[PDB]
Amino acid sequence: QEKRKQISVRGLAGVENVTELKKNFNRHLHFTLVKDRNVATPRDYYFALAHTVRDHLVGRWIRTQQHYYEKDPKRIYYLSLEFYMGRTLQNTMVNLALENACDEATYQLGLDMEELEEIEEDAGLGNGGLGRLAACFLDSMATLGLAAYGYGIRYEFGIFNQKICGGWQMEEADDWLRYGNPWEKARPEFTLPVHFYGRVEHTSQGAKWVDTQVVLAMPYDTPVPGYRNNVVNTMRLWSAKAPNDFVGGYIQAVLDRNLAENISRVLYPEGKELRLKQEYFVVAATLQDIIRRFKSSKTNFDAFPDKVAIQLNDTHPSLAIPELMRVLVDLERLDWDKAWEVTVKTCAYTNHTVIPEALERWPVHLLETLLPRHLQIIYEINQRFLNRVAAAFPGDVDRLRRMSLVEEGAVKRINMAHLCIAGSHAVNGVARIHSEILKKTIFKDFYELEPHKFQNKTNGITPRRWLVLCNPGLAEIIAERIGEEYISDLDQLRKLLSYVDDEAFIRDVAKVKQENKLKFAAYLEREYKVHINPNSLFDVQVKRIHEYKRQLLNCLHVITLYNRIKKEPNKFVVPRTVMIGGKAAPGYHMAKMIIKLITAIGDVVNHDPVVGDRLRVIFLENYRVSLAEKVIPAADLSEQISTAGTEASGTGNMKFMLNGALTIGTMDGANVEMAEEAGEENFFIFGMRVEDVDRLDQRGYNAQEYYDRIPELRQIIEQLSSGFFSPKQPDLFKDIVNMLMHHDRFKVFADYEEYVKCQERVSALYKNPREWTRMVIRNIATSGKFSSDRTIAQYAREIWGVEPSRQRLPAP
Amino acid sequence: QEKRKQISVRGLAGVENVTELKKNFNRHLHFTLVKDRNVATPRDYYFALAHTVRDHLVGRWIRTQQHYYEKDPKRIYYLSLEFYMGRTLQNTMVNLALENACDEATYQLGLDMEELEEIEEDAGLGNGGLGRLAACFLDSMATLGLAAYGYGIRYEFGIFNQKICGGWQMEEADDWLRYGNPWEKARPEFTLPVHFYGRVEHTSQGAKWVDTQVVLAMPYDTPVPGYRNNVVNTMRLWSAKAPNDFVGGYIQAVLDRNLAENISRVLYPEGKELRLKQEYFVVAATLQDIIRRFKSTNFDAFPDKVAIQLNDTHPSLAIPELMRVLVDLERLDWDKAWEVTVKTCAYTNHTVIPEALERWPVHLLETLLPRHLQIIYEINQRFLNRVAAAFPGDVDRLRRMSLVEEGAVKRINMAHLCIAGSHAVNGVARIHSEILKKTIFKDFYELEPHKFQNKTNGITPRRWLVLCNPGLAEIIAERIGEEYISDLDQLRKLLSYVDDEAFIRDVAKVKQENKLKFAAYLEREYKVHINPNSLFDVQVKRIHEYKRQLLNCLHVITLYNRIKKEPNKFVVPRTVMIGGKAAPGYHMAKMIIKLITAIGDVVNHDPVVGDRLRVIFLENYRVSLAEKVIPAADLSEQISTAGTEASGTGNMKFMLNGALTIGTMDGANVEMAEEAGEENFFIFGMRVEDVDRLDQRGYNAQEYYDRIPELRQIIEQLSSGFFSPKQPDLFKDIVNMLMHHDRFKVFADYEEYVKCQERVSALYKNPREWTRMVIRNIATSGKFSSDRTIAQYAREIWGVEPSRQRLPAP
Numbered sequence A: 001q002e003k004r005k006q007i008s009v010r011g012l013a014g015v016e017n018v019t020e021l022k023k024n025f026n027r028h029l030h031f032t033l034v035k036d037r038n039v040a041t042p043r044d045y046y047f048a049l050a051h052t053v054r055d056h057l058v059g060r061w062i063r064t065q066q067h068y069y070e071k072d073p074k075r076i077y078y079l080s081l082e083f084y085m086g087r088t089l090q091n092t093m094v095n096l097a098l099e100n101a102c103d104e105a106t107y108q109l110g111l112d113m114e115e116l117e118e119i120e121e122d123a124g125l126g127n128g129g130l131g132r133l134a135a136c137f138l139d140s141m142a143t144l145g146l147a148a149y150g151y152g153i154r155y156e157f158g159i160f161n162q163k164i165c166g167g168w169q170m171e172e173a174d175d176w177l178r179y180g181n182p183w184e185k186a187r188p189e190f191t192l193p194v195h196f197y198g199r200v201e202h203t204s205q206g207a208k209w210v211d212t213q214v215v216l217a218m219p220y221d222t223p224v225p226g227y228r229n230n231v232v233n234t235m236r237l238w239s240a241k242a243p244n245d246f247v248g249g250y251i252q253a254v255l256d257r258n259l260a261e262n263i264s265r266v267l268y269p270e271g272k273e274l275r276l277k278q279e280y281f282v283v284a285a286t287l288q289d290i291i292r293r294f295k296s297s298k299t300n301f302d303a304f305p306d307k308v309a310i311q312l313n314d315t316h317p318s319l320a321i322p323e324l325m326r327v328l329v330d331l332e333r334l335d336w337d338k339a340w341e342v343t344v345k346t347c348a349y350t351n352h353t354v355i356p357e358a359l360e361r362w363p364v365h366l367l368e369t370l371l372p373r374h375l376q377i378i379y380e381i382n383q384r385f386l387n388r389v390a391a392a393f394p395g396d397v398d399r400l401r402r403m404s405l406v407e408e409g410a411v412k413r414i415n416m417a418h419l420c421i422a423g424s425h426a427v428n429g430v431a432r433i434h435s436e437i438l439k440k441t442i443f444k445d446f447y448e449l450e451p452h453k454f455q456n457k458t459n460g461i462t463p464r465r466w467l468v469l470c471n472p473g474l475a476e477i478i479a480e481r482i483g484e485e486y487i488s489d490l491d492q493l494r495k496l497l498s499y500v501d502d503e504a505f506i507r508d509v510a511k512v513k514q515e516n517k518l519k520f521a522a523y524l525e526r527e528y529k530v531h532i533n534p535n536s537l538f539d540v541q542v543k544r545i546h547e548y549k550r551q552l553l554n555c556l557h558v559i560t561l562y563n564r565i566k567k568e569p570n571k572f573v574v575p576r577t578v579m580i581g582g583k584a585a586p587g588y589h590m591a592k593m594i595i596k597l598i599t600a601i602g603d604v605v606n607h608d609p610v611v612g613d614r615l616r617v618i619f620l621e622n623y624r625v626s627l628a629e630k631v632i633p634a635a636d637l638s639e640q641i642s643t644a645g646t647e648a649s650g651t652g653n654m655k656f657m658l659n660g661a662l663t664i665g666t667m668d669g670a671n672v673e674m675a676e677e678a679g680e681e682n683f684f685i686f687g688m689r690v691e692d693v694d695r696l697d698q699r700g701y702n703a704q705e706y707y708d709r710i711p712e713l714r715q716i717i718e719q720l721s722s723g724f725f726s727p728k729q730p731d732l733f734k735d736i737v738n739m740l741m742h743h744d745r746f747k748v749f750a751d752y753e754e755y756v757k758c759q760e761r762v763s764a765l766y767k768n769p770r771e772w773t774r775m776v777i778r779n780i781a782t783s784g785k786f787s788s789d790r791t792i793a794q795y796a797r798e799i800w801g802v803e804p805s806r807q808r809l810p811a812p
Numbered sequence B: 001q002e003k004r005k006q007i008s009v010r011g012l013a014g015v016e017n018v019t020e021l022k023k024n025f026n027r028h029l030h031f032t033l034v035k036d037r038n039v040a041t042p043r044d045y046y047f048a049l050a051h052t053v054r055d056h057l058v059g060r061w062i063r064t065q066q067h068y069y070e071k072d073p074k075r076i077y078y079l080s081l082e083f084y085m086g087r088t089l090q091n092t093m094v095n096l097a098l099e100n101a102c103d104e105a106t107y108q109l110g111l112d113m114e115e116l117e118e119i120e121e122d123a124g125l126g127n128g129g130l131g132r133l134a135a136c137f138l139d140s141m142a143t144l145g146l147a148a149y150g151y152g153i154r155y156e157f158g159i160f161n162q163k164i165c166g167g168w169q170m171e172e173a174d175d176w177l178r179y180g181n182p183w184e185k186a187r188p189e190f191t192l193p194v195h196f197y198g199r200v201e202h203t204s205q206g207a208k209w210v211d212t213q214v215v216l217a218m219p220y221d222t223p224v225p226g227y228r229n230n231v232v233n234t235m236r237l238w239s240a241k242a243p244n245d246f247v248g249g250y251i252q253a254v255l256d257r258n259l260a261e262n263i264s265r266v267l268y269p270e271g272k273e274l275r276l277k278q279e280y281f282v283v284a285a286t287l288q289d290i291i292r293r294f295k296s297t298n299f300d301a302f303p304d305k306v307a308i309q310l311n312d313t314h315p316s317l318a319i320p321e322l323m324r325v326l327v328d329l330e331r332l333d334w335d336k337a338w339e340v341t342v343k344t345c346a347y348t349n350h351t352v353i354p355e356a357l358e359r360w361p362v363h364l365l366e367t368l369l370p371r372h373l374q375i376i377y378e379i380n381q382r383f384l385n386r387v388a389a390a391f392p393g394d395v396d397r398l399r400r401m402s403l404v405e406e407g408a409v410k411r412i413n414m415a416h417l418c419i420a421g422s423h424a425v426n427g428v429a430r431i432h433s434e435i436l437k438k439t440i441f442k443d444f445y446e447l448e449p450h451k452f453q454n455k456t457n458g459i460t461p462r463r464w465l466v467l468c469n470p471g472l473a474e475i476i477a478e479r480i481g482e483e484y485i486s487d488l489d490q491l492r493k494l495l496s497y498v499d500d501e502a503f504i505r506d507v508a509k510v511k512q513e514n515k516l517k518f519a520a521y522l523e524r525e526y527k528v529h530i531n532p533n534s535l536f537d538v539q540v541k542r543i544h545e546y547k548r549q550l551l552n553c554l555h556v557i558t559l560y561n562r563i564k565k566e567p568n569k570f571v572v573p574r575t576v577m578i579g580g581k582a583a584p585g586y587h588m589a590k591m592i593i594k595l596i597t598a599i600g601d602v603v604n605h606d607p608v609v610g611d612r613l614r615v616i617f618l619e620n621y622r623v624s625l626a627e628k629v630i631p632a633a634d635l636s637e638q639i640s641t642a643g644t645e646a647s648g649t650g651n652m653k654f655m656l657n658g659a660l661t662i663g664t665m666d667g668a669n670v671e672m673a674e675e676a677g678e679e680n681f682f683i684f685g686m687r688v689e690d691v692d693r694l695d696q697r698g699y700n701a702q703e704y705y706d707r708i709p710e711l712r713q714i715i716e717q718l719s720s721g722f723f724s725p726k727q728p729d730l731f732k733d734i735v736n737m738l739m740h741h742d743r744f745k746v747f748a749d750y751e752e753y754v755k756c757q758e759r760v761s762a763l764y765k766n767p768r769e770w771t772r773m774v775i776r777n778i779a780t781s782g783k784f785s786s787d788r789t790i791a792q793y794a795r796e797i798w799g800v801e802p803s804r805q806r807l808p809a810p
């Protein structure tokens, strides 16, 4: 029927227009929300505005998906158990260029588009740099016009909210879906069975997996927009539902429903059965969807590697390998050799870890119980892989056992990293030194078997959310020199390097900072009721709380600096606000104490009359994406102080650099590459290198020798032990001292001298505003390498086999 | 801020603009559904249209609510456990006059609206008459401008879909919410706690109900549109949610999470805890909403600004819960709160047999609602005090009127609660209301005679004429205009056309048209030929012994035997249709359904019968099927043993739709035969006082079995396994019941029933007389408009005046 051709998007999102936006706001507030102004809450005004914006997203979304079906490109699937999405309202507006029109519309309607913006929940789909990487990636993948899908789990309660009560962290539930989410769209039409347990029957033609428990995976779609290019991609999130049954004897299987349901309930965290059901759930539903989409296109799986690419972000979705094999062999009735070829060619794997302890391993008895068919396939893959290894290195019997997917001991275990390696055509580290240690130590055996398989894709950040969005002031003055262009091409921030000796640009760069400090200082009062000197150097360390992250080294310096303000109260010291934020893992007893320690240091220093405002110590509560975007552009100094070799890359690093902060750090992670781009001279690189980490384990790290040679280190330890910082509980901080002094596995005391000295240099350079800003410029100018546009282009050409494309799609 | 005035509903569509409906249909498929014509399903297209119609509904909804806060009128709250809504799309199009525009709109978009209409699920919200009544009343209350709210529970899996496999009823889950309900609106922001268990603590200022388990009640709003008057009222349904808190152990909070959500999962149809939980849940959540709206203050103005209708005793806890909120929370005193309670609340009784009234053991109340018990005990004592006053020394009367009944187990009689806490107790038909005064509640009557009222049931002529029978609505409006739709009594004007040939042939024509559409639907599923010229003989009732489809079966089989015996005899062909659901756990009902299909297998495949007889069991009888078969019927079977039916709302549907009624003197039949004239009715069988006489000298089914050879042959056929050749014994427990323990006297009404059916067949042989009789039934229908019923609620109970006035929407 040719009449149906009037069922079109043809003129529905007519004009990005201030009058139309007001019309839709009303339309959405009244018809969609079923509210009016008499009962509308700020939250209801936010939903209305969100819906108004979503219409523009979805129109562009329809065309893009229509475009992909017309042009049939190689499709790329990004599998992650984490999508650290943050807020979408503002990000959608910059990328669609609706920023000014909306503000104009809401103002005219009598509302503040800022009030509204702050009602939006941080999406509870993520926890760390792992999920934030995936978020930057999706945004970059869309900007470079790639046919790309983010697949994950729709979590309901995310990772807890952090409240600090009397210095102690408490974990509140993050019910960020209590009032729903305007951005996502339910697809009950597309609900899919996921199997668990049962057993394997090896009859005739092949294996049948029978007598299984079914869980239903129901997808929710969220559009992810490119930068001003009209391409809107899909993030598809899976939600678990128990099947609705009415043989009639007993309901005790209430258990089932509940145990099915909480696959989607919470993020994690060692290895419960639940964590494994999450991994399989996401993998099994995702693969059905990919194969479904491969089939509709105008069965031959020779073209499969040519139309599908699947990225495993870490080992979490590793079961994709045996699952893809399972469908191809058991269901589509291919044979092992052919399916294997298709699998290896389809899958690639990204590792994010430096230490062989942290890699994922599951007991075989677990796998045998929940995924009996998958254990078998994993063994078969082990047999044939270890066959290649035996052919390539005859005789070397030790090699077979080291490289095996099966790990022998008390507790037979499957090593999931060895699986991903055997079944991926490409494997990559996440920063150059990291990818090198992968080749050199952690996976040397696999690298020697297949050198070509091992790559590097240094991580990156999106300049949308991490420059234009959160620091418009900086984006605005860069534009004036070189245009609106760098936003999609960060490389050409290099042209700023000709403006280093330009006077007006220096005050300009320094003026933006002051204002970002002003805004953030005011934000601290309006919410947590706590004083801040806006002239002071902003010393910020925002990372997960962990021993190797070394916020304790930071603390050591703070108390050091504090002490010297008491030994020499009249000496001019460069005034500083030291700010530390980050979430501690529940159960992690040491990180809990470290937070308590920080706030106690704050409790002494912020109320000492001799200090005044020359030094201040704040813990930043409930660190997350939206806070990141508030505190980052307000930073002068970026604390990247992990023990060399313990960081794979880092990503906050690059955010601070893009935003006019200078870095104090170790020669570690992506700092190596950041210093390589800005020049050693423009970074504050201090302390032991990786070579001296190994050197010290070799001769044995004694921490007592430092305690003698440095009287300041002796003094702070005495203050800690006698209870200077915990007067009502003197021995509160004992197992912090104990660790630092006897079982400090991350050598805090070692780097302390060369740290506090490097810090003094910083203060001295901050005392000189002009010279300080010139170096900041020299940092910002050379921050281009660290865009996620660069990272994804390398992924597209070197791993996926597809060309990036900045061409704007037509419509709407 | 004057800027904020720009936040308004003045710019939506406008309105009967096919143009804008097309544009808005497109919006919704693409932007609301995030689909397109590449990928879209007929179901998708139904949601696109549903949403389009919805935009216009909620506009008027916003206005009707706004207007209710300006005018601050008395508000009426209808509390029902069931709400048999059916389908929403077409009802909304006709009530808003959007039908023609949407029809044309979808048509120019390459789509067919009927096809789309068939996609919608019946709301899984109700079971039988009780539930359809609430739904009809909601339509009426909106049409008569009343400020009404329907309050109930949002059942997730309704009450099962019926499937017939191998002639047996099977019950599948009804997930009618499977793809969502476009008509509803979640309100997570208005979630309320509901308390259960725990214990009562006496302070010195008042009672505290503490240590309770909490269940969250979340409301879903559905708008209900008035007929073309622009008042869109609210149906507010509660969904149960468990709280969250995540420090262990133990996790049997997993069980609380489940028993908490079962509340909302399924309707009934054990003497469950769960059912009581359901009843308090809808009462506690509703009363909070009712009080919030009042305050949004002294409660002296309460009974003048709030009416609470109890539909059956199911929401009877509303009376003690009101007392709880006013004494305990609101801090009134027990006499002031009591006056407010007795004047706020009006009850409605739907039963006829003493042991059908709701009754909860005290041990159970003591466990889950300890405070409510103490309130009941107090109410009972004060109440019994005035019984002893008004009747000195009458100790016998006190232990009859007590709310606390006593036997093996101590029980609270929920009906006696309702009468005591209500100013008006209404029956639902005249002979029913009267027996409430006469035998069932006489004690209560000779104490408060002013209390006891009648409100005969009615049926909305929107759904049940205009919507399901547009052919008959059209021909009626060709003579007398369209004013009757909202004043059914105007159909009396049709008496003037009883001899008019144009009318007589027009009515017969529409009927014949309705049968052809239904035979076509019927020939699809159930693969058998329907002779469209046969008399459509239809019985649609809950499947029960007393309802009596076994009597219908006895006639069906007589007819068969008679054809098989004299094949060359002229016989008026019949399509016999029986439909209804059997309660799970009711074995006799399941067997009756087996009998109906088993008669069907023999008769419908007998070459000797040709197409003179056909027996069909209609699968999964429900509101949207009802509205297909009713217009097609010639003969409505209303044959319950006399005195067992209080009313009978489907009776009125057939009458309005051109069927003639065979049936006993009982329920609504009496008032129907009274309006239409007995001569225009096929009343047969024992009357009420006749049943009583047979009771008094004892009913022996052998002395009916013995006097009648035709009756005998069919029983020997049943017993011998004539209708179940593989399993001769299959119907043994049916024969046994009919012979020895028939508490319902099937055999006794047999002879007279078949005599009367022959009168039906004979009149059917004369098309003109048949149709003229039909006209007399239709023309005389109007009393049974649910607008009539509701106006009598408004004036004589709730004390508001109904208004047919329109309302704007710019």
Ligand SMILES: O=c1[nH]cnc2c1ncn2[C@@H]1O[C@H](COP(=O)(O)O)[C@@H](O)[C@H]1O
Residues within 6 Å of the ligand: A061, A062, A063, A065, A066, A069, A070, A293, B034, B035, B036, B038, B039
């Ligand atoms: O066959 C097609 N032709 C054109 N567009 C399609 C087709 N199938 C899917 N799409 C687009 O892709 C979306 C659904 O994506 P899917 O999950 O891959 O089927 C729809 O909203 C369409 O806009």
Ligand SMILES: O=c1[nH]cnc2c1ncn2[C@@H]1O[C@H](COP(=O)(O)O)[C@@H](O)[C@H]1O
Residues within 6 Å of the ligand: A034, A035, A036, A038, A039, B062, B065, B066, B067, B069, B293
């Ligand atoms: O104070 C008021 N002024 C105007 N409209 C109101 C007011 N209060 C409630 N409403 C309307 O009543 C509707 C339902 O709210 P509810 O009566 O509280 O259940 C809302 O959609 C409002 O439009």
